[PDB]
């Protein structure tokens, strides 16, 4: 199918509490390979996938150097932003940055993105066309004007259409056993009596990759969305995921319900019935 490479950066100012915390994580699809922490010992970009571990000193030095410049940039950002909003110095604040590129089945560039949040709400985002920006408020306008002035978007676009798709593809080939796989979910159902007149029916999808998956319950063909308890898709820890969906069934009615599992790794929807 299609793939994507994305980098996520978090910076939090620690008033009088040493420099601001900087955390950077890199993913191809739902798998991580990089990760940098200001509090960590190494002060290096560190490998977090097997297929990236033997990239070579040139790579790691180059990646360490750059992510260090990202951390300086964000530390400088937390002050500028404190300015735009006339905030005090005593408080902790958050900057969040994500950028990356999606490629299609052909592994050709599909789209790029570049988003920025302050205190957990949109601040500024490069738009579809990779030419124009969306500013969230009066403060982000100034940034917009500054970035337009400096052709920030052009330099972003060059990265997303070249370097980003280029290395995504290197990784995809290099980690093909991990990155190019699809683990369809192992599915099962469980039944627990709530009472002598109710029972909880739970649909499990386990050990799947990638994370996108739809689990739904029907009763006689009709989707029980309002009455379905659904948990967020969660990491298992081994690079796979899990999810479950539950409904409460009157005892005796288990046969009226079906669970439907859709996942890229399944040659076709999966209808489950407690029988």
């Amino acid at each position: 199918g299609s793939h994507s490479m994305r980098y996520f950066f978090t910076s939090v100012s620690r008033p009088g509490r040493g420099e601001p915390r900087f955390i950077a994580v890199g993913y191809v699809d739902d798998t991580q390979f990089v990760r940098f922490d200001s509090d960590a010992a190494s002060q290096r970009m560190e490998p977090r996938a097997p297929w990236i571990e033997q990239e070579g000193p040139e790579y790691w030095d180059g990646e360490t150097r750059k992510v260090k410049a990202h951390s300086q940039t964000h530390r400088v950002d937390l002050g500028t932003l404190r300015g735009y909003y006339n905030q005090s110095e005593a408080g902790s604040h958050t900057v969040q940055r994500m950028y990356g590129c999606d490629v299609g089945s052909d592994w050709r560039f599909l789209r790029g993105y570049h988003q920025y949040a302050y205190d957990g709400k949109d601040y500024i985002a490069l738009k579809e066309d990779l030419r124009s920006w969306t500013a969230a408020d009066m403060a982000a306008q100034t940034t917009k004007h500054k970035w337009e002035a400096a052709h920030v978007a052009e330099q972003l676009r060059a990265y997303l259409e070249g370097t980003c798709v280029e290395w995504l593809r290197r990784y995809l080939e290099n980690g093909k056993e991990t990155l190019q796989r699809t683990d369809a979910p192992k599915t099962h159902m469980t039944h627990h009596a709530v009472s002598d007149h109710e029972a909880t029916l739970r649909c499990w999808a386990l050990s799947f990759y990638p994370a996108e998956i739809t689990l739904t319950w029907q009763r006689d063909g009709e989707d029980q969305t309002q009455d379905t308890e659904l948990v967020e898709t969660r990491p298992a820890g081994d690079g796979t995921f899990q999810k479950w969906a539950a409904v409460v069934v009157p005892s005796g009615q288990e046969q009226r319900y079906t669970c439907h599992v859709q996942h890229e790794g399944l040659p076709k929807p999966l209808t489950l019935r407690w029988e």
Binding site: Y7, A24, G26, V34, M45, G62, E63, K66, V67, A69, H70, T73, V76, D77, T80, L81, Y84, Y99, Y116, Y123, I124, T143, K146, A150, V152, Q155, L156, Y159, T163, C164, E166, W167
Partner: peptide, 9 residues
């Protein structure tokens, strides 16, 4: 590979 790049909000 991360961005190479500067910036400054």
């Amino acid at each position: 590979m991360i961005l190479g790049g500067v910036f400054x909000v």
